[PDB]
Amino acid sequence: LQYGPLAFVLGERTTRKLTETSKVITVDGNICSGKGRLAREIAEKLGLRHFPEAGIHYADSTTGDGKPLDVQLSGNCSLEKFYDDPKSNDGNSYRLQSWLYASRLLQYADALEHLLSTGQGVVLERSIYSDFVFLEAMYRQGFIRKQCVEHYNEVKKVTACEYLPPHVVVYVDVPVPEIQSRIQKKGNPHEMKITAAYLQDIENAYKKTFLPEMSEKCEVLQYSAREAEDAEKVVEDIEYLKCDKGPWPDQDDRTFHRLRMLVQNKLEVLNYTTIPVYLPEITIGAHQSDRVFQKFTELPGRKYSPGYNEDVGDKWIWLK
Amino acid sequence: LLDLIWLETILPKTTSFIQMKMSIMVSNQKGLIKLYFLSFLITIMISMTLFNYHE
Amino acid sequence: MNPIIYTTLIMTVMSGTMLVMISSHWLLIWIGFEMNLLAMIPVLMKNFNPRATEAATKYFLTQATASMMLMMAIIINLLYSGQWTITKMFNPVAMTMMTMALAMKLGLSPFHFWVPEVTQGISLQAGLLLLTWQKLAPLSVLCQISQSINPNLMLTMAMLSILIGGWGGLNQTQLRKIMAYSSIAHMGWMTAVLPYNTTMTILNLLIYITMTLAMFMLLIHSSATTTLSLSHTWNKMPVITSLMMVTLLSMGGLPPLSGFMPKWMIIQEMTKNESIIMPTLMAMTALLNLYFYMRLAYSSSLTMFPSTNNMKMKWQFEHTKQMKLLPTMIVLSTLVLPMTPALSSLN
Amino acid sequence: RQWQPDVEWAEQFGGAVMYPTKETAHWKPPPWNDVDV
Amino acid sequence: IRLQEDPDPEDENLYEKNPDSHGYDKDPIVDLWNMRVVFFFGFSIVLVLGSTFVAYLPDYRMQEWARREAERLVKYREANGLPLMESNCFDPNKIQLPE
Amino acid sequence: KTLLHKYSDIPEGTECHRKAYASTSIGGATGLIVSAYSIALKPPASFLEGVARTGRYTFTSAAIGAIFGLTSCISAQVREKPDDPLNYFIGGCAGGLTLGARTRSYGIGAAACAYMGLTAALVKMGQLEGWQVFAEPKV
Amino acid sequence: MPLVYMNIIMAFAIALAGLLMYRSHLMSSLLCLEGMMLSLFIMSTLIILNTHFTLANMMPIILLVFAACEAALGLSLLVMVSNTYGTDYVQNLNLLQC
Amino acid sequence: MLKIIIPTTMLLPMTWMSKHNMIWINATVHSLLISLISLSLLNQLGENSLNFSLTFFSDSLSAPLLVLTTWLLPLMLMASQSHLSKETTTRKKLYITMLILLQLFLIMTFTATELILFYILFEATLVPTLIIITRWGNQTERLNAGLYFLFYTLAGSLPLLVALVYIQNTTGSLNFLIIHYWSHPLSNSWSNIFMWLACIMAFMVKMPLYGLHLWLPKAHVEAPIAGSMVLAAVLLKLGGYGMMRITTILNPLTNYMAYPFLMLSMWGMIMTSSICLRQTDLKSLIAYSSVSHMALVIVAIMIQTPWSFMGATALMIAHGLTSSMLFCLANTNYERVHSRTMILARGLQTLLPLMATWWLMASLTNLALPPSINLIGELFIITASFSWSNITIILMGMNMMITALYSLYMLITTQRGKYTHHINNIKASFTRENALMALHILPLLLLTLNPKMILGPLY
Amino acid sequence: MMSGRPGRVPLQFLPNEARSLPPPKLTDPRLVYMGFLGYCSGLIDNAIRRRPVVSAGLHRQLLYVTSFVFFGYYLLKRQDYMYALRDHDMFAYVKSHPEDFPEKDKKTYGEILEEFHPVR
């Protein structure tokens, strides 16, 4: 069976499979800093498990067929309409932040779960600790309401506390004049009007709290735009640390068993993201929720438990 | 006056009010261990006492 | 806790309870209660959160106090008769003394203030152990000494427990508090009939037990800790709320939903003993338990409640727990009313 | 469509104590995760 | 926008889709079949053969039997001349009066 | 049950002063028990406030018992029938009215007459017939 | 029943009352706890020796060796409640209001 | 009786095993078939109940009531596929399951030989009715109604429980037969009075009796249409059925310990019918009408008179058929206008010509127009009550006067008058609504020809 | 009650002297009732695990009814035992203490005087 209490009793450990390539290396920074491209190179050369930026459609990406579901069936919030209208009365602003943080948290569990079951380090774009900077900046510009800031906090406090912090964060320090020049190079029809003040408020939010917070919990390795392009230098940089700070170095098989218990169960990881705090942006009434759930249930695969859907061709269902 | 003022207040509302009124007191314990044990001490004392739980 | 450590810990808790039910010597009885307490505390202190530390401290203080208060009652029995067997005690003071000590460990009389709080702080899974398995050993001893019990004291313990059980549960929102107050009310129901018939106490024990795991482990599967958090379960798991509602209806004791079987037989047995005001009062105030039972049933399945946007995420993934013994517990706690003449099996 | 409870209905059932009083007005609902040389 | 709830639904006029709709179901063919089978096992099967069944049930309360024995009693008790109806039913000879 | 035995020993509708005396002792002791519990579960301020709450609860309970004791006995004297449960009923309502005076609310006093009046009739009801609230194990 | 026999009995009653009401300190509460077993150990000892219960002399030592399991677990709980809250003061155990 | 219970139980898989849209058809046709088998029991032998086994028995009292329940079962099914069609397959499947579990308990209740077996199923009808009222009820207050309904009848039923078990240990057996043959005179001791109160109060609450009647205006106003009729058409009669059955051991304590109930009922009918003279809500108007007619049966039963009993059962079933029907009338108009107020929808005879008729002889049957068995029921009670006391007619006669004024009043306000100007969504009435009305009217007037099949055992 | 019956060996589910009773028939209505309970549990089981209620785990459905029907038969024998045991020592006490079981006089209603209460 999967990792259970029986397996640990009969031999299944975690420290035996742990090795040097067991570092959580989160790449973070300003919008349009090439951190995503740099993360691929770091994971490629180090042999680390890369993790692409978990968007609105990451949860459906991880389960089912991985194909994106309809926005009504997943998220009910689009970064496209987000950028188009700042203060939409439908509350696409905060609803996106809560859903995106949920995908970041889900991605974090996949990193730890895969790391503990295989022993290969992980690199992820942004992080569950890299998601508060946006909402804080989103609050300063009035992109959300004040209670959105509060509701995001207990969701973090109830959830983010349980998981372990990373070891060496990767920062691509890119100034405002560069990313204002960089955004127009792509030409997608929702990023061409990103308010410069928004990207301005992203970086100083990183300055004041982001680096200082994890400095006591992990090493911080900053890089400029030039210092990030040469991925050869940073590779040796991250291989010359100690990661003594944070609770990660002190980790016996006792705590490992509990952590693998929670990440292998893909319900408790995201259980508290639905904390019953009724906010207008994120609360869905009974009628709308019921109709969408019927739409979700009638979809293939989700009708029954996985491996129990005759509509896809599951044979031997009478004896499974 | 008769149907949905008095007859709904004689039986239903009076019982509902009494149950709620006695509910707000019996469930509003202060959580302090001192008063809990002191409440036991009365119960232990008086139980072996004036109710004559010996004859 | 390492699973091997935890498994052996549970194992001695069961052994401690088992020793109580199979020991003729009074001293061995106190040993079984001592071992049960000795290993109950670490199970509560598994999550290691301040509420758990609060709950364990309260549980230990009241249980240890009753444990040695129990030991004092045995010595007085030795002081007045020189015996050690559990047949019928020989000193009226010791009768009340141990009845108080035994009862406090069940949390029914004014000696019950720990029960709502101790289950609140500790986790739900360990709560199942506290309100199901830790309630057989003291009941086992009480059945053995039911001959010498003092009816005046014991029935006063029953009335207060049912009255406080219903009244306390009306004002609570934390569903853990709901369960404990319901458990106290059920405890008063079973505890009233020991002077009359021990067999009916046993039947009330199994039915109440199966009902508690049915409710508790369903609550485990839903992963909810408040009424509001339980409300959202309809969106993710509509089925769970469907059986959870029928368990609540049975928990009230509405026929033909089994759970009315103990209340029915308890009323009948006391009625044979010319006690007829007593059955009526407990039966009348049994409706108090139904009110918060319906209230919990109302905002879980009967009426859908405003869910959350992130709840759509939960639909994609599936439960990993194999919910062992959950299905047959629901059926055994909801449909066994026609199979009532199995009372003879207990005798 | 039939009536369905709204957020106001939930808040009526959502307090720490369903029957509030001045003796319980200051009370606060428990944290959701129970965590308080 | 308060809550993300669906707007009030619009009442569906069954005659709008099919003018010959019959209020038993949206789908016409089974809508037609529901009528034929509700009327059949209802207006006809139970309301007619059921009605004559209860109407033609054998003697209820033994009414006819009560009449037939009745005149035999009167014809007997009018022929002899003793009163056709005694005041007391149970024979006082068979009874034991206390004291 | 010596305190209750005082009430039982005095036959109804005779020797009213002692009948009231027994009722006062029953009321005062009952008021003392609840007052002690209230002090315990809800600790008040400095002891003078504690005895002040004790003074209220005992005085209310003693007053309820006293007036109930008088009415239940003097009425049986006037109406020349001691077995009638109505004797306790008026006394039950009479005692219920005092609670409204002590609590300073007509509604609470009206409710007490409605309920305590009925229960007092029921308490006398069992005494006449022979009801056992706490029946010993018989079968 | 001799004068001394109930000199222990009241001592148990005084120890029980001392444990049944807390003044300010959990250690002092614990002190009344094993004080109660001391009288319990004591009271049993007179009974067994007086009655010449030649085989019951087992019971006292195991009464102590098992009351220790309570005590050992007892302070070990307090050390937990006195390192999060810092103080063994028992009025800080009201965090479980709701 | 297993020829009825077994097919009813086997119909439960029948619905759940059915296809997507065939659930309504199969459930309706087989329930109608079950009704036909129920009519096989109308023949009651001379003076003996049709005792089938120790578990189940039937006499002329439950014989009309049983077939009323089975006949009802299609009618809720025929009255439900309007608002239920906009729902998932499971929830519609669940709804049918509940009513069938409802009738199954009702079938078992009326046929039960043992008072305890009577008792268990008698309260058990709460469980399906409660969920039906709460789940699919189309209102907000229904949540309070469910509590009001459940506790009120249970608050009387629980004291009943202690009464039966006391009889079992004292008298011996508790079945309907031995009690009748071994009946003994009940003394006047105050304990016997309380047993009389316990053995009676549970049945009066479900009638209801005036004062203990506030759970009808709550439940009926916002219950679902299907659940509204059964609760109105039989569940009230369920309290009635126990009244004849259990008043076999309460003699002669009935004579003295009935005056408060007779005074509460004989005055309540005037008061409750005076309610009906003015109601803003049509469904509330019908619910209070059921209180008055049921209050007649309480008077009928409590006198304990041969003529009174036959009038009681005749009115009991007759009221149920017409009260259920009038509730269907409310559902139709409420469906078109999406409201319950009287004056909102008016002058509906012009818009809907046939419904003007259906609501018309529905009112006449509610009016006890002779020879409709509503008259043969009410008129019998007057004669029995008048023999009991000559002043009963002053009150009970005045009921028929008050019953007329409000009965036509809803006919005047809704059907007659001028059409409402703004209302324009009233389409032609579907044949389902018209048929359902006929399924009620025709058996009523058809049964007028043979009242002997409704006059009960005392006939 | 039987508690300490003279010869009740402990921890004995179905004592060997209970075999003198007629064993319950395989098609007993009580016995098959909990075969339903096993079946009724079967639908519940896969329902929680989100599986086709009727057609899924036919082996699981077979186990639930078979396990229920097995433990039921032995439980039913125990049920018949004690009730028969309850009746056995019952009658034995009657002819062991005849003084507490007098025979009431069989006097027909011809002499019995039951007062009649008219109802008007």
Ligand SMILES: CCCCCCCCCCCCCCCCCC(=O)OC[C@H](COP(=O)(O)OCCN)OC(=O)CCCCCCCCCCCCCCCCC
């Ligand atoms: C005692 C009185 C009654 C007490 C109990 C009352 C129960 C109903 C009311 C409960 C109270 C709350 C109100 C209802 C809430 C329902 C919430 C719910 O979960 O509804 C939706 C849910 C979805 O079900 P789903 O997962 O889609 O599976 C369908 C079947 N595949 O729906 C479901 O999960 C329902 C699925 C139904 C499956 C039943 C299967 C039955 C199979 C029968 C086989 C018969 C074979 C016969 C053979 C004859 C020959 C031998």
Ligand SMILES: CCCCCCCCCCCCCCCCCC(=O)OC[C@H](COP(=O)(O)OCCN)OC(=O)CCCCCCCCCCCCCCCCC
């Ligand atoms: C025939 C023999 C007997 C003859 C004498 C008659 C009987 C005894 C006297 C009457 C006893 C019943 C009447 C009530 C007595 C207690 C009254 C009392 O405690 O009042 C204080 C208080 C009520 O006021 P409170 O809610 O605090 O609001 C104000 C706050 N500032 O109280 C409370 O807040 C708490 C709720 C009330 C106290 C608990 C219940 C007390 C009564 C229990 C039953 C007593 C039965 C006595 C007789 C039988 C036994 C001997």
Ligand SMILES: CCCCCCCCCCCCCCCCCC(=O)O[C@@H](COC(=O)CCCCCCCCCCCCCCC)COP(=O)(O)OC[C@H](O)CO
């Ligand atoms: C909402 C309140 C209730 C609504 C109204 C319900 C009906 C009113 C009466 C309720 C009576 C319930 C208890 C009756 C049990 C069965 C009665 C019975 O069998 O008769 C006995 C009547 O005897 C009784 O004492 C019965 C109880 C009398 C009333 C006292 C208790 C009931 C009222 C209080 C509890 C119920 C109200 C709810 C309170 C929250 C005869 O026994 P006996 O007294 O002759 O026995 C032999 C010997 O004399 C010793 O007993």
Ligand SMILES: Nc1nc2c(ncn2[C@@H]2O[C@H](COP(=O)(O)OP(=O)(O)OP(=O)(O)O)[C@@H](O)[C@H]2O)c(=O)[nH]1
């Ligand atoms: N809310 C939220 N959005 C995020 C987070 N991380 C990334 N995004 C979104 O990811 C999208 C792409 O980010 P960009 O920085 O523009 O991506 P890029 O141009 O590839 O540049 P790099 O991120 O530097 O690789 C934007 O919509 C961001 O808001 C996060 O933690 N929270």
